[PDB]
Every structure is written in structure tokens, then in C-alpha cells.
Ligand binder design. Sequence first.
Ligand code: HEM
Length: 390
Amino acid sequence: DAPTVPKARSCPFLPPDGIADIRAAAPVTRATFTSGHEAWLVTGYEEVRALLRDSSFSVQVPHALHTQDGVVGRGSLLWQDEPEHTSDRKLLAKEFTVRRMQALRPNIQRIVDEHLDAIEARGGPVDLVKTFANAVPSMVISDLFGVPVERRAEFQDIAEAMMRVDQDAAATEAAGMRLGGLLYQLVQERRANPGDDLISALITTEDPDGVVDDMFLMNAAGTLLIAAHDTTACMIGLGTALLLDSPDQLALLREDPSLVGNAVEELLRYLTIGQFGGERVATRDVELGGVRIAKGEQVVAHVLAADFDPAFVEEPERFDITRRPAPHLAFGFGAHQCIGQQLARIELQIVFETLFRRLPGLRLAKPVEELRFRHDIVFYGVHELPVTWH
Ligand code: HEM
């Protein structure tokens, strides 16, 4: 009967003032979480950072936005006990490199431009979620996986159905089984004709050792696609809405287009999508913030609270794209820190730069209070985002 976690905010566009008092008084405390179980709630920036850094806490339940009901071992990272996590991550990171992510900029520009061509070809108003936020990220992954333009239609549909919710338990599993089939065939085809893509590169990676089999490759491909899709789509949808509901910051961006990178980092901090780190368990006794956490006890990082700690940034409640980017914890920290963060940053940069440039006078087609948020314990995004432009 530890107290329930205080609600941080009623809307992602507001400061999370509801968690401030706990963070200030007790940055490591006991709370009861939505499942009805108690765990250590960690909200201070310093302590969340120290928790994520410490391999004494192993992940039991991954970050909520990186998993689907829903899907489908070695190569998945998310659902991986140690020491396989470490070695499988090292294998994947050998080919899914920051270099490979940077190398996708022209692909990302192309994809973003293609989606905006379709949008302005039709006008006006459009739902930015269906036409853009949900569509772009899976097509970037399609390119990462070497999917021919053919070929994209099928990939988009299957990935889309995977995100769909609401779909019933069955419908949900059937979507997962179709994705599984697609990915299995994809792996066979890349074996049959290798290319310059990530899957081809893994098939051919240094593997002493022999862990990279078809199962490993399906697990990695599924994980990256699923992890990249709802996270990035949420950032695009909520980030666009937050900018549109912040005419002060939008004006600063329009006055100084070089702020796009700063704006992406501030949106990441401000929204801290998913709110919590994956639930961890102590594999040994550990002292965190002066508090003894016993082996076997659960620990939940309140990353949103950490990203609003006044010890971390000044006047944290302010949404201010002029800030020099600070090391927020929206991509985590330590061993499980987000492996796709450079890709996410690159995609959001191209997305926001192109959107606001190509659709001058972009604005909400309906007041903000009419937006409908996907919320299930935490916010997953907006259902639709009706927009117009000049
Ligand atoms: C778009 C915004 C994204 C955000 C805000 C985000 C956030 C995070 C966070 C906070 C973690 C750490 C979870 C924890 O320590 O409990 C994480 C891990 C992870 N992320 Fe992301 N992510 C994003 C995009 C992506 C993308 C694009 C990919 C893949 C291309 C991805 C793949 C992963 C994977 C596989 C992990 C687990 C890494 C491991 O367990 O070693 N994420 N992400």
C-alpha cells in the first residue's frame, strides 16, 4: 500500500508539475504502480542517471513504447537476459552503426519529401498522423533493411497493422504472424542476394561463435522495426503538435532555422516519451541516493521527472528550443541506452526542417483541447493531428 505514483500532467504539452514535489523531497521512494505492485520510484536526475548506469539493475520489462502486444531471444536485446544481451548488442552494433544511420540521410530526405508531395498534392486539411508521422519511420526501416521500392507497399501495410491498436487479442497476434512471415522471407532473400543493407551486413558479420542464424536475424529485424516505429511516430506527432501549440517557440524557429537541432533535443526532453524506463530488478544489494535497495527488488526510473529536475536544467517547466542541448535522459543511459538514438535524431531533424519549410504557415486545423491522445498508463501519441497550411 505504498502511495500511488502522482500523475505528472494531464497532457504532454504541459509541465509535469505533478511529480515535482516527490522529486524534490524523495528522489528515491516506494510507490504502488498501475499493475498494483510496489517498487522503488526514482525521479531525481542524478539518481535516475546512476540507476541506468549501474549494471546491478537488470531490465525485466522493456520501455513501453518499444514493444507491441503483439510480436513476434538471441538478437532481440529488449527481451534478453545477461550476458547474452551484451554480446548480442555488440554483434548488432557492429553493423547497425552510427555511420550506417548517417548514411541514411539522403534516404530519409527522399522519404520525407515523398510523403509531403502526397500531402500537398491533396490539400489541406490532412491528418498528419496517418499521412506522415506513422508512415515515415517504417519506410526508413524498410530502406535500412534493403526493401525494394516494389515491395514497400506490403512492408508499410504489415508494419502499420502492427502498430494499429485497437485490434483484439487475435487480430493482434495475426498481425504479428504476418510480420514474422515477411521478415523470415526478407532474411532468405538477403541471403539469396546480399546487398549494402543492414540485414545483408549481419548475415556476413564476424561471428566466431556462430550466434547469427536466421532466428537471430529475425529477432534483430523485428526489434529494430518495432522499436523504431511507434517511438519515432510518437515524437513526430506530439513534437509537431507541441510546436504548433507553442507559437512563441515556433516564431523563434522561423526566425532562426538553425534552431532545428536544438528544438529536436528540447522536444525529446520535454516530451520524454514513455515516461518510465523499463522496470529493472536489483541483482545484488545496491545503495542509490543513500537508500538501500535489496537484491530482487524492482526499480522504476521516472525519466520524465528526471528530465524536469531543476538540478539538471534551469527553469525546466519552460518549453524553450533556444536551450543549448543538455544531456537529457530521453534515450536512457548506460548499457541499455537507446541503440537507435542517432537514427531518431537524424530522422526528426529532417522531418521538422522539411515539414515547416515545405508547409509554410502550418497550423492546427482544430484547437488543441480537441486532440485525442493515445494514453495507456503513459501517452503513446495523438490519434490524429488535423493540420492546414498556406
Ligand atoms: C524516437 C525516439 C526514441 C526514444 C525517445 C527512445 C528511447 C529509448 C530509451 C529511453 C531506451 C532505454 C530504455 C531503458 O533503459 O529501460 C531505449 C532503448 C532501446 N531503443 Fe529506443 N528510443 C527511440 C527510438 C528508437 C529507435 C529509432 C530504435 C531503433 C532503430 C530504438 C531501439 C531501441 C532498442 C533496441 C533499445 C534497447 C537497447 C538495449 O536493450 O540494449 N529506439 N530507447
